[PDB]
Symmetry: C3
Subunit: 90 residues, 3 copies
């Protein structure tokens, strides 16, 4: 048993975000070209995936957090995290 | 035990595809800027990864589906899924 | 129990790299538009994630290799792999 990670990168820098699922929680570490710091994201999950896109002045990040058969989408859109509309089936 | 996901995004929209391995099968959910729908992809796997690239009028998606020690590549190239040439070793 | 993969793609080609964790080791397979070959990367891990970015003449790849609660970042920057500064917490 090992922790599970997901990574994304963006920008003219570039910047990196790494999400780690451990002990039922996903946390976030971010690289800005100088150092790693802990991001604001902290939500439940045992498995994580991520994707992102940069448009305008905002990175948009989507984190898919799964526990059991429930996957929750978390959305960063420039200045905050909110729960997304993702569902695994209709 | 939790389901396992992989996510990719593309386009001036953007669009998102999320692949989920559950019960030995990988299925696909897609976002088009308005809603989530179920994609055509349905192949066996217990672990999944994905990458994609947009060139021309087609998103090209590569899904790596693993069961045991066998990983199968599935290729979307604009208008259909086909098995790729990927092998894990020579 | 299945092997675990992570995939990234880049370039005007494009090229693909697929990393597989199996038996405690991560290995690398690469596609150049013609065939799959085995990459140089070979480091311990039970879980893997990846991201990459292309700037200049070099693909830059970051591989996050986890065993237990330890995640090690491996950095490709055009012509070699080195251990990165990533840590999971301060
Ligand atoms: C990009 C979109 O933002 C909004 C969310 O509700 C959707 O599920 C999707 O991620
Ligand atoms: C992009 C290429 O398409 C073709 C496949 O057979 C290769 O394995 C690769 O994915
Ligand atoms: C892009 C940067 O390269 C350097 C590394 O030490 C950092 O952790 C990061 O990946
Ligand atoms: Mg992704
Ligand atoms: Mg990927
Ligand atoms: Mg990634």
């Amino acid at each position: 048993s090992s922790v599970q990670t997901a990574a994304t990168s963006w920008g003219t820098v570039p910047s990196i975000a790494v999400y780690t699922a451990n002990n039922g929680k996903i946390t976030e570490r971010c690289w800005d070209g100088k150092g790693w710091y802990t991001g604001a994201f902290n939500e439940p999950g045992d498995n994580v995936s991520v994707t992102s896109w940069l448009v305008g002045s905002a990175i948009h990040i989507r984190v898919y957090a799964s526990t059991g058969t429930t996957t929750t989408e978390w959305c960063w859109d420039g200045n905050g995290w909110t729960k997304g509309a993702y569902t695994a089936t209709n």
